[PDB]
Paper text:
Bacillus megaterium encodes a functional sulfo-SFT pathway and the corresponding gene cluster contains a DUF4867 family member, SqvB, with 51% sequence identity with E. rectale SftX. B. megaterium SqvB adopts an α/β fold with a central, characteristic β-barrel and belongs to the cupin superfamily (cupin from latin cupa, a barrel). Determination of the molecular weight of the predominant protein species in solution using size exclusion chromatography-multi angle laser light scattering (SEC-MALLS) revealed that SqvB exists as a homodimer in solution. The role of DUF4867 family members in the sulfo-SFT pathway has not been determined.
Author numbering:
A (entry chain B), B (entry chain A): 2 to 223
The structure:
Amino acid sequence: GSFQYMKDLNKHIPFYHIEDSKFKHYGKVINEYDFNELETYMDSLTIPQDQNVYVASVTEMENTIIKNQLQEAFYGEMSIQIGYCNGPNSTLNGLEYHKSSEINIAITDMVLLLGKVQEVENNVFHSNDVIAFFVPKGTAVELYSTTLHFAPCKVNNEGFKTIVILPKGTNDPLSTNIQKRTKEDELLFMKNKWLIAHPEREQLINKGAHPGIKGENIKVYQ
Amino acid sequence: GSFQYMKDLNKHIPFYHIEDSKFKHYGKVINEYDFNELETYMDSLTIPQDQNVYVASVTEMENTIIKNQLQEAFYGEMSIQIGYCNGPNSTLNGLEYHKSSEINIAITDMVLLLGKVQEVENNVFHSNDVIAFFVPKGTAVELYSTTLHFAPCKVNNEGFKTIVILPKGTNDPLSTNIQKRTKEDELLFMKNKWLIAHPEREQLINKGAHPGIKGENIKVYQ
Ligand SMILES: [Cl-]
Ligand SMILES: [Fe+3]
Ligand SMILES: [Fe+3]
Ligand code: NA
Ligand code: NA
């Protein structure tokens, strides 16, 4: 099916299924929960064709039995938000991390281009360290805090839909302009979000993102 | 030198300095902040001789410039608490993680026994996967969310003192009794804290901890 097709089209990058043991360094597949209340909301959305969209916190999705289950158990009673990231993207563009776990639920098939925070050296990450993981429709994953990640890359021509679950407030605008002291301070970009942008990605550079991906702006062919 | 003395006494454990590059898999050494406000408070304490003490949130230590600096920059605007863990312990006892970053600042020399969350299999962690890191007085470290850790082990006969900084609420008592569904739900122990206890530690098992460390309850000799 789509997995083998995509693997064949992407021999320029290491390209694995999300169920591969290689994913274990980056996160965990979550199997025990069902997400019908969230799927219902996501069915009412359209995928944008001009650029990706991200909404960090959606009342409809947070006002659900499943959000309470995930807050009290998966996040150990820390307050969460549930949003979405949908779009037409096929390129790496940037890599971010949070000092928290993220859940991504694939509402369509999609690909995640991932890295490790430990592979950042002096605010540079090399494209040649990226690994791609094919995530089938319906699979939920935890991305660990040490996993660099960004918007998905599409599998179907029509683009992708994903649910994104984070501690409440993550990705909100910064309310203060810190006096930068550490290397990582150069990467802080939104609340609980550190970002390394590809220099060829003008949409990020124009917002003041730190240019730090060295290498190709990887494309996922489909 | 205390480091080489301790390394020589602990050849049964892989034993490294916190400045060793191996620690970069588990966290980061924090170098550009000034913790003098907190050091002043910690100098006013002695070390308990009978058992460890952990106080999660100390108002005086949170009403500091450093607290604001670390909240707005290191934690990217997410609310934090500042407390301490001091005591006479020399054994592994347990291994915990949070889905957040922790800062430990060594007020005395101390040793951290660490593991990786990805090395847990069916809620078991093997003692032979533990690594020890010697942390000199004055060093501050970030422990990543994927780093299993617990209370320090002492270097000096008098015990150790450490500052512990976490997202606000971490380690509070759980307010809900979840339906257990995932393996990790068996480990949830306090707010934002999952614990794998050594089966010999009744102090932990009696409080509801999951016995899951297979192997010796490692002792750090000094
Ligand atoms: Cl990791
Ligand atoms: Fe993210
Ligand atoms: Fe901890
Ligand atoms: Na499970
Ligand atoms: Na329990």
